[PDB]
Design an enzyme around this catalytic site. Sequence first.
Site, PDB file in Angstrom:
ATOM      1  N   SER A 121       1.247  -1.324  -0.054  1.00  0.00           N
ATOM      2  CA  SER A 121      -0.098   0.595  -0.342  1.00  0.00           C
ATOM      3  C   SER A 121       0.816   1.182   0.418  1.00  0.00           C
ATOM      4  O   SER A 121       1.728   1.092   0.351  1.00  0.00           O
ATOM      5  CB  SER A 121      -0.898   0.259   0.943  1.00  0.00           C
ATOM      6  OG  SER A 121      -2.039   0.246   0.994  1.00  0.00           O
ATOM      7  N   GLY A 122       0.645   2.290  -0.703  1.00  0.00           N
ATOM      8  CA  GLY A 122       1.224   3.051  -0.939  1.00  0.00           C
ATOM      9  C   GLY A 122       2.682   3.804  -1.995  1.00  0.00           C
ATOM     10  O   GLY A 122       2.703   4.708  -2.610  1.00  0.00           O
TER      11      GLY A 122
END
Length: 224
Positions: free
Chosen positions: A176-177
Site C-alpha cells: 500500500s502506498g
Amino acid sequence: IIDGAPCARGSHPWQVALLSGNQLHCGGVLVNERWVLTAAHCKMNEYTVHLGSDTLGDRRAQRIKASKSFRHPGYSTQTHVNDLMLVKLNSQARLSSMVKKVRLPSRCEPPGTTCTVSGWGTTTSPDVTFPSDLMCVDVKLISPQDCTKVYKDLLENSMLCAGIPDSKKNACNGDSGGPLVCRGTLQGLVSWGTFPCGQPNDPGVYTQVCKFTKWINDTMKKHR
Ligand SMILES: COc1ccc(Cl)cc1C[C@@H]1CN/C(=N\N(C)C)CN(CC(=O)Nc2cccc(S(C)(=O)=O)c2)C1=O
Ligand SMILES: [Cl-]
Ligand SMILES: [Cl-]
C-alpha cells in the site's frame, strides 16, 4: 507483492517504507529531501520512514521520523477516491546513489504500457509472509473501460488499473502506498484491489499520479 522476484539491487532508490515501530505499515516514494508520497489510507499520527536499502531492517538504512502528513482534501474513507498523501520528514533525507527522488510524471502513460510495482508486502495471500527484500512485479496498465468491466462503479477516472491477463501478479497487504513506475516516471500509488491478493483477472487499482502533480507541487510549496 505476488508472483514476483526481488528487485534488482539499487534500482528503486526512490522507494521508502512507512513503519510503525519496527513493523511495516505502507510503502511510499521519495519526492525529494523533505517529502514522501504515499496513500491517504496509510495515515498515522507519526511515522518512521525507512530509506536507502532494498533490505528492510538494514544497518546501512536511514530512518527518519515524520510528525506531519497531509492527505488529499478530496479523499474518501468510504470510496478511497483521491487516495494520496504527503508525508513531511522531520529532517531532510541525505541523498545518495541509494537515495533518490522519484521522477514525477509530466504525462499519463496509456493503456498497455509495461510497469513495475514494488514493495515489502505479503508475498502470499490469505496466509501472510513478509520479506525483507523489496519485491518487484511487472504489470501492464489496463484501460479504464476494461477495468470497469470488473470493478463497475467503484472506479474513478483518477484511478488507474494494472495487471497481467490470467495472472496472479499483483500487489498485496503492506505494498500500500508504494510505487508503480512505467517508463521511468511514477504513474501509480498502490491503493486497493480484491482479497485474497493475486486472484487472476482482478486488477490492482492505483491512484493515478499524473492527475495530481499540481496538488503535489502546490502542497510542497505550501508547507515550505
Ligand atoms: C487485498 O489487498 C490488496 C489487494 C489488491 C491490491 Cl492492489 C492491494 C492490496 C493491499 C491493500 C490495499 N488496500 C487497502 N485498503 N484499501 C484502502 C481498501 C488495505 N491495505 C492496507 C494493509 O492491509 N496494510 C497492512 C500492512 C501491514 C500488515 C498487514 S496484515 C494485518 O494484513 O498482515 C496489513 C493494503 O495493503
Ligand atoms: Cl490531514
Ligand atoms: Cl534539516
